[PDB]
């Protein structure tokens, strides 16, 4: 009934970091895969980080040691933190609940902003 | 489900495999109907999925 | 093939554990006994070829 959820953004900051983090709305949330879906006009499909609910990531075989995600429940808020970014890495990030073995009651967000150009 | 590959063949009363015992494991009694196709088309990107 | 050796297991217990150790360990098709309940038979001789 509510999302709470990609709620942030950033600008053109080639070489930098990207401190995007999407929260999640008190609801019963025990099983949730949070992920990270690009949504540039062409590629649509895109699987970034992993939100399994013993506490272990995976990470996808082309970013390898190049993407860091940590747990966080202090304020109920997952961080993200990546390094080295391209410049083809202007898209529109989201953070899916219902990610693949779903699509049932699936529900998206509406975007964060995040684009560079050098 | 996707499995992997042209592995379909594997979801048979009988048939044993890697992905077919330890993934998605059909019983030997099993009544009832398998469909399969590919979706180079549909799930394709320029480097990888 | 045609000079296949043949090493005879005897006088020892077969705990079939270590046996599961290489990724493609696919065919692995048993005939006259089934994949399990075999931690509880007691043979007479074992064989293997190559």
């Known amino acids: 009934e509510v999302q709470l959820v990609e709620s942030g953004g950033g600008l053109v900051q080639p070489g930098g970091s990207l401190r995007l983090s999407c929260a999640a709305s008190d609801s019963s949330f025990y099983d949730y895969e949070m992920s990270w879906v690009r949504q540039v006009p062409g590629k649509t499909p895109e699987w970034i980080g992993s939100?399994?609910?013993?506490?272990?990531?995976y990470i996808n075989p082309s970013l390898k040691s190049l993407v860091t995600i940590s747990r966080d429940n202090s304020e109920n808020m997952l961080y993200l933190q990546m390094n080295s970014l391209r410049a083809e890495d202007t898209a529109m990030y989201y953070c899916v609940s219902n990610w693949a073995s779903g699509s049932t009651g699936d529900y998206w967000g509406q975007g964060t902003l995040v684009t560079v150009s050098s | 489900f996707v499995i992997r590959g042209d592995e379909v063949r594997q979801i048979a009363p009988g048939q044993t495999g890697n992905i077919a015992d330890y993934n998605y494991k059909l019983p030997d009694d099993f009544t009832g109907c398998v469909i399969a196709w590919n979706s180079n088309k549909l799930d394709s990107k320029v480097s990888g999925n | 093939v045609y000079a296949w050796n043949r090493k005879r297991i005897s006088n020892c217990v077969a705990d079939y554990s270590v046996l599961y150790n290489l990724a493609p360990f696919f065919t692995f098709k048993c005939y006259g006994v089934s994949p399990t309940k075999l931690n509880d038979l007691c043979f007479t001789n074992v064989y293997a070829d190559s």
């Open positions: 939100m399994y609910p013993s506490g272990r990531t």
